[PDB]
Write a protein that binds this ligand. Structure first.
Ligand code: X22
Ligand code: ZN
Length: 99
């Protein structure tokens, strides 16, 4: 049920990062199901349509995917039920832990 059948394959996705000036890894992004829109560092997940932008140095493409778009069927089969929930518990723990 992918929102962009043309961007379904990895090859088509890194193809979009031919002018990537940002330090977030292009191969990592492509593998997480993202491609670029030539509009700042904005990226769209090929399958869920989920859009991410303003990446920070410490930010894992997979982790960011699960943080904002956990419904994603592509994410689920790549990384798993437990992975997705874990990322959410981690943010739940941190906020609780920080006084
Ligand atoms: C990707 C890691 C980054 N540090 C981050 O968390 N970005 C957030 C984000 O992309 N979104 C979350 C909140 C804003 C954050 C930026 O401070 C909610 C969902 C997501 C989003 O939809 N971003 C938008 C967008 C567009 C313009 C300005 C701000 C956010 C978006 C929409 C379409 C395509 C790309 C990004
Ligand atoms: Zn997705």
């Amino acid at each position: 049920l992918p929102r962009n059948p043309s961007m379904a394959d990895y090859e088509a996705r890194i193809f979009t990062f031919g002018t990537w000036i940002y330090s977030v890894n292009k191969e990592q992004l492509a593998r997480a199901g993202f491609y670029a829109l030539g509009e700042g560092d904005k990226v769209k997940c090929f399958h869920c349509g989920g859009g991410l932008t303003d990446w920070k140095p410490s930010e894992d493409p997979w982790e960011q995917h699960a943080k904002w778009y956990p419904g994603c069927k592509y994410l689920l089969e790549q990384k798993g039920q437990e992975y997705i929930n874990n990322i959410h518990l981690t943010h739940s723990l941190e906020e609780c832990l920080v006084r």
